[PDB]
Amino acid sequence: SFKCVNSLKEDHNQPLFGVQFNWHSKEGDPLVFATVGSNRVTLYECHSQGEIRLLQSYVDADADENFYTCAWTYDSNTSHPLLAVAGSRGIIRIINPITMQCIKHYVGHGNAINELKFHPRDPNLLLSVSKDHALRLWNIQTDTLVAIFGGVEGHRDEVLSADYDLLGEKIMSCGMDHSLKLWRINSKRMMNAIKESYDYNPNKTNRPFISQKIHFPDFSTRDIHRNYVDCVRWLGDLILSKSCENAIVCWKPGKMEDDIDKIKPSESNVTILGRFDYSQCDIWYMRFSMDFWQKMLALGNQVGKLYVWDLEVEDPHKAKCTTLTHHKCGAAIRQTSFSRDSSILIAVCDDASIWRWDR
């Protein structure tokens, strides 16, 4: 079981909106996690006796930038880890975590970026979701915009979260329009577009790279939540999503026996497989996380309480809940992250505090 072994606070006293362990850290190296808040990203190393060792930050030249999200990948040629960060300026920065140099950056979104996710099988495919109502898929090997997911049948308000399924064949997105939308990226069109993005070298051609405009989701529902949907994750063929209504809903498109890959864009039904209720999480932009194996789920609420659900049970509604509290942890927890071996859980807070829980 988890025990609180340490805490600290960052000097900017602004909300920490994101935290991510590097699950690509090398064998024998210490566990490392990144935090994002204010205009900075900071790396820490976990050591014995609860020590949280401060390494080095990247601080944006723009004092008005506010980083919201980060995501780890690695360089596909060298294996060295890379860190992507983004927030209110709508600029994606690719950071070398060793030196905290910004290697390159991407602009395109019309507004703030609310989440970044890397493809589960391709370290170069980066998904961003934005306040401008669109998702964008980037190839950070050839520095190309592969596709924009939008249109009037796309989201009609800010996109707040998205997630790739296990094989990276499809994306589920969600946001302020209360909707969850499915976008298949294993279509012939999208597989071809990804292949072409790898063949693009601007020094060897005259053409710009053409991005796909994907204006129709492969499924859409507004029947799960009744407010902003701010976090979504695949659990196999099922979906876990939450709003600001003190519940994570486990659901699937279609009827109970409907295969996810036979769902048509006109599908009108959903099936609710369970709901995990909790308390005092009425504000939006509050993210849950899962461990590497998807055996557990952790969510913090707006008064500093952690909920952890054990999903190693026969059916989703049988999940087993544990709660973790500390008398000094009273600020809203924006995001959690498990280490890859699941031995450490980190929570970060609106008062710039960081909380370490060891199993």
Q: Is 289 helix (H, G, I), strand (E, B) or coil?
A: strand
Q: Any idea what DSSP says for residue 189?
A: H
* Residue 100 lies near another protein (rule: CB under 8 A): no
Q: Where are the beta strands (DSSP E) in 263-351?
A: 270-277, 289-290, 296-300, 306-310, 320-324, 333-338, 344-349
Using CB under 8 A, which of 350, 355, 356, 357 touches another protein?
350
* Phi, psi torsion values for 68, nearest 5 degrees: -110, -30
CB of 351 to another protein, least distance (A): 10
Nearer to another protein, 144 or 161 (CB): 161
Using CB under 8 A, which of 2, 74, 198, 284 touches another protein?
284
C-alpha–C-alpha distance, residues 351 and 281, integer Å = 16
Task: Using CB under 8 A, count the residues that bind another protein.
Answer: 13
Stretch that binds another protein, among 1-9, 74-82, 119-127, 277-285 (CB under 8 A): 277-285
H helical segments located in 147-210: 188-199
Pick out residues in 296-315 that bind another protein (CB under 8 A). Answer: 302-303
Pick out residues in 6-65 that bind another protein (CB under 8 A). Answer: 15
CB of 333 to another protein, least distance (A): 11
Residue with tokens 């050839």: 142
Q: Where are the beta strands (DSSP E) in 165-230?
A: 170-175, 180-184, 212-214, 219-221
Q: Please say whether the beta carbons of 267 and 251 come within 8 A.
A: no
CB of 284 to another protein, least distance (A): 6
Using CB under 8 A, which of 19, 332, 345, 354 touches another protein?
332
* Residue 69 lies near another protein (rule: CB under 8 A): no
Radius of gyration of the chain (CA): 20
Using CB under 8 A, which of 94, 116, 244, 250 touches another protein?
244
Nearer to another protein, 169 or 351 (CB): 351
Q: Could you please report the per-residue DSSP string of 9-65?
A: E-TT-S-EEEEEE-TTPPTTSPPEEEEEETTEEEEEEE-GGG-EEEEEEEE-S-TT-
* Residue 278 lies near another protein (rule: CB under 8 A): no
The length of the chain in residues reads 359
* Residue 227 lies near another protein (rule: CB under 8 A): yes
Q: Please say whether the beta carbons of 82 and 97 come within 8 A.
A: yes
* Residue 228 lies near another protein (rule: CB under 8 A): yes
* Residue 94 lies near another protein (rule: CB under 8 A): no
Residues that bind another protein in the complex, under the rule CB under 8 A: 15, 227-228, 244, 282-285, 302-303, 331-332, 350
